[PDB]
Amino acid sequence: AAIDPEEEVIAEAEGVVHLHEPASILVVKARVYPFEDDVEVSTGDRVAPGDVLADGGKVKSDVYGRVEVDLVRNVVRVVESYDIDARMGAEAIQQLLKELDLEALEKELLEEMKHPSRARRAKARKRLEVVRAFLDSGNRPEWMILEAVPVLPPDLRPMVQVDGGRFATSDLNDLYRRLINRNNRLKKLLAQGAPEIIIRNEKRMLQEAVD
Amino acid sequence: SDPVRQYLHEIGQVPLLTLEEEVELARKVEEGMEAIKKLSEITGLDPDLIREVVRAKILGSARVRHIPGLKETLDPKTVEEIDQKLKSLPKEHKRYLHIAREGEAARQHLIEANLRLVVSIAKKYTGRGLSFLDLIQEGNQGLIRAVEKFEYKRRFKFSTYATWWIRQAINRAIADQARTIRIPVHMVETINKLSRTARQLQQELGREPTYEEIAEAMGPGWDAKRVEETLKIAQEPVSLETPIGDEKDSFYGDFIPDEHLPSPVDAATQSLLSEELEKALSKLSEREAMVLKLRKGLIDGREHTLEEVGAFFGVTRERIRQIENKALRKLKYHESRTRKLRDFLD
Amino acid sequence: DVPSKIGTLLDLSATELEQVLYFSKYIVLDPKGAILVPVEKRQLLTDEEYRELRYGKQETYPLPPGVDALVKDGEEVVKGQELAPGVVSRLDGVALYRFPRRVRVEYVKKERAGLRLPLAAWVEKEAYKPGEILAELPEPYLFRAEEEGVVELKELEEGAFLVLRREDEPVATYFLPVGMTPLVVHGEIVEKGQPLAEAKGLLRMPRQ
DNA sequence: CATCCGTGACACCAGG
DNA sequence: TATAATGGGAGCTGTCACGGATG
Ligand SMILES: [Mg+2]
Ligand SMILES: [Mg+2]
C-alpha cells in the first residue's frame, strides 16, 4: 500500500512473494505460533504456558510471555516475559508497610536478640524499638506515607494588603501551588494514556514537591 | 541525585526513529483510531469507553482509573466485561480490536521516541516562572496532543507538527501558572504587549516612558489611566518572609500589623457602649425599650418592620411607630440631660 | 531522619529507600515466577533488569544500503549467527524484517510449448525435472521453424522461449532448453524450415 | 574495630 | 495548528561534634 492509490502495488497475476533488502532487522526472543482460525487473544495480553492462543483451542501457549498478534504474517507471536509485579515510589513502600504483621516481626527480632554476634543483636534491638513503638502506640506504619496532604488554615499563611495597597504573602502558598499544579497534571496525565517515562517523571516531581 | 539528569538519562534510552519507523508508528496510530471508530459502529457502545478499554489492556492492570467523561467507573470488572463483549465478535470484526490494540501500542512508543524534542524546546523557556521539569512535563502534554492530532498522509515529519503543540502547551502553562494571583491568558497577553511596548519606547527614548507615551504607542482605546490600571493590576505579591537586615533575625512580615482582629481598646469600647445603651434603655418602659431593641436588631440581629413589631405587641403599625417615636424622644431628652452617650459617637 | 523509620522497619538502607522513593529502581511485590536465580520478593531491579523481565529481550540492527540479508523472515537465529555480511546477532530467537525495500514476486506460468529432436538423440521420459537431461546429440542439429511468423524471443535465466505470430496472433510456441543457442532476434520474420536455434552435444532442462 | 561522611548546632536586647 | 527542528548547566568554596554507614 501507499499514500495515494496510483503508488500502490497490485499483483498482476498469480505468484508468490519474497521479501529482500530490509531497512533494519529485529531479533526478538519470541515464540512463533501460526494460526488458521479465529484467534482468541488480542495484542498486549499476558499469557502463561498452556493457555488457549487461537483456533478454538487447538494451538496453545508454550512459554511465558506477551502476545503480539500479527495479522500480516498470520502468526500469534509471544515474546518471553513474566507478569512480574514491581513498583516504584511511595506506592510500593506503602504497600510493603501495609503488609507487615508487627507481632511476627517482633518475634523474629526477639529470636535475633539471642545471637552470639554483638552487631546483629544491636541491629535487632534498633529495629525492635521501632516495632514496639508502633505496637504500643497503635499507629500503622503505612501512615508514614501520605495520601491526603493537609492544608494549613489560610490565616496562618496570609495574603495581606500592605499600606501601599500591594500584597504580601507567605511562602507556604507558593509551595502548596507547586504541589497542586503537579498533582493536577499527574491526575490529567493518568486520565490520558501517558507512557511510563512521563508518569514516572511526574510522580518524582510530585514527591519532591511534597518534600 | 539531580532529577533533570535522571530524566535526561531515562530519555536517552528510547532510541530516535528513522523516517520509516516514524511513518509506521504514525500509520498504526491513525489506523487504530479508525478501528476504534469502526468498533463503536459495530458494538453500539461509546467510542471513549472502547478506547479506554483498549488502552487499559495495552498498558496493563497497573493503571486502571475512572475517566471523567466516561459515564461508568472504569474498574477491571467492567473492562473485563467489555473486553468479553469485544471478544465475542466474528473474525472480520475482531480484526478491528486487534488493530486498535496495536494502535495504542504504537501511540505509546511514538510519544516515548520524541520525548527528546520536548526537552530541546523547553530548555529555551526557563526563567519565565516555571521550573525546567515543569516546562518539560507541559511540553510532554503538548507532545501527547500532537501525537493524537498528527496526519501522516501530509508526508511531513513528526517534529514539524509536534513543535507547534509543544510551544503551545509550554506558553499556556507559563500564562496559567507563573503568577500567585492568577491572571487570565488574554490579560497576560496584554500585559506582555505593554511590557514590550515600554521596552521599545525606552530603547528609542533613552529613558523609561511615561504613561502617556505608552498610551500613544499602544494605539486607540489606550489612555494614560488605562496603562496605569493595567500596571497596577499586574503587580505580583512579595514574600512575608523577605529578609530585613544582614543578621538573620528579621522578616518583612514582622512589621505588618494585624488590622482584622479588634484591639483591646476596640472591644472594651464596644462593651462599654452596649452597657451604656442598656443603661439608657432601662430608663424607658419595658414596651418601648423592647420596641427599639426589635426595630434596631439588639434582640435577634436583624431589624424588624413596623408590621412585625406591631403584630408581636398586638397593636397597629401606626401605634408601634408612635411608641418608637416617643421612645426615641425620651432617649433624646435623657441624652441631652446626662450626655452619657455622646463620646461614643466620635 | 537517619536512621530512617521506614528503612528500619523494612530492612531497607538509605540508598535503597531513596532509589525506590525517587524512582531509580523497582521493588518486587509478587514476582509471579520471574527468573533473572529466580526473582525473590523485595529485590532491587534496575530499569534494564526490569524491562528484560517485564517486556522481553530484543534488539534491532541496521542494514547498509543495497545489502541483502543472509537470513529470512520468521526464521529462528542463534547467538553469533551472522544475520548479514555486516551484522552479527548478540542473542537468539525469531528474526524479523522491519521494512523490506525490494519485493520480488515469482509469478506462476503454466503454458504449452513444442520441440523437434532427432530420435537417435532423445532420452524418453513421461516428464522432465529441472536440470534433467532432455537429449544427447552426437552432432550439431538445427531446430527448424514449422510455421511462418514474427519471432517473440523470451529468454529466461537459462534457456529461452520462441513464439511466432502471423497477424499478431500466436501460431507457434517453441521451447529451447539449455544447450540450444537461439539463432534469431526478437521480432524477426521466419519462413517454414529455417533454423531457429542450434543444439550441440548435451541439452538439459533449465533450473527454473 | 576503625575511618568517612552527612547533618546538626553555633548569646541577649536594640534597629534594621 | 504542518519545512525541520530530538539529552542542562551552574558551581563558587566554616568549625566542630555526633551518630550511622562502610569497608
Ligand atoms: Mg493611544
Ligand atoms: Mg535581634
Curated annotation (Swiss-Prot), chain C:
Leader sequence range is none
Job description of the protein:
DNA-dependent RNA polymerase catalyzes the transcription of DNA into RNA using the four ribonucleoside triphosphates as substrates.
Subunit composition and interactions? The RNAP catalytic core consists of 2 alpha, 1 beta, 1 beta' and 1 omega subunit. When a sigma factor is associated with the core the holoenzyme is formed, which can initiate transcription.
Family under the similarity heading: Belongs to the RNA polymerase beta' chain family.
Protein's name according to its UniProt entry: DNA-directed RNA polymerase subunit beta'
Species of provenance: Thermus thermophilus (strain ATCC 27634 / DSM 579 / HB8)
Recite the lineage of the species: Bacteria, Thermotogati, Deinococcota, Deinococci, Thermales
What gene, per UniProt, encodes this protein? rpoC
**Full protein stretch here:** 107 to 316 of 1524
